[PDB]
Write a protein that binds this ligand. Sequence first.
Ligand SMILES: OC[C@H]1O[C@@H](O[C@H]2[C@H](O)[C@@H](O)[C@H](O)O[C@@H]2CO)[C@H](O)[C@@H](O)[C@H]1O
Length: 139
Amino acid sequence: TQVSSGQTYKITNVKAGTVIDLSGEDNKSIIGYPYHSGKNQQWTFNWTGKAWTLRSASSGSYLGIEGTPADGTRLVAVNDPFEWHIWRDEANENAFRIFVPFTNYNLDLSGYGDTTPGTPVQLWWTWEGLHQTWTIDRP
Ligand SMILES: OC[C@H]1O[C@@H](O[C@H]2[C@H](O)[C@@H](O)[C@H](O)O[C@@H]2CO)[C@H](O)[C@@H](O)[C@H]1O
């Protein structure tokens, strides 16, 4: 299925089954959480002409990062649009990886896809670990 600029999606970890969630505890931390159709679990995609931005349907903040890209950098809500590269996974064409542009750092559900609600979403160097792959589909 198609992913289109202007549309809003939930983003589900292939390993864990939890979704990318803007924590209701602080409205800042990005975590894995069971899907309940919350608007803090919905992300409005925009194609800027060169990359993707992801805007929280609940807060209007954007999906971004805490500090310079590194293994373990936390994803956080940020004020300004933050650009991502989004590609189909090489092994699993149904899923995606979400990269900091022009780097090898992609979104990674921490603890190797720990299913625990509240597990942080982080950056990590790209590799086959399934906790780095995500489905993108309608809420
Ligand atoms: O804790 C992450 C979790 O937060 C939920 O929001 C809670 C929040 O934790 C609580 O502090 C606030 O006072 O009540 C909210 C509703 O129970 C989110 O609903 C969930 O999606 C996660 O983000």
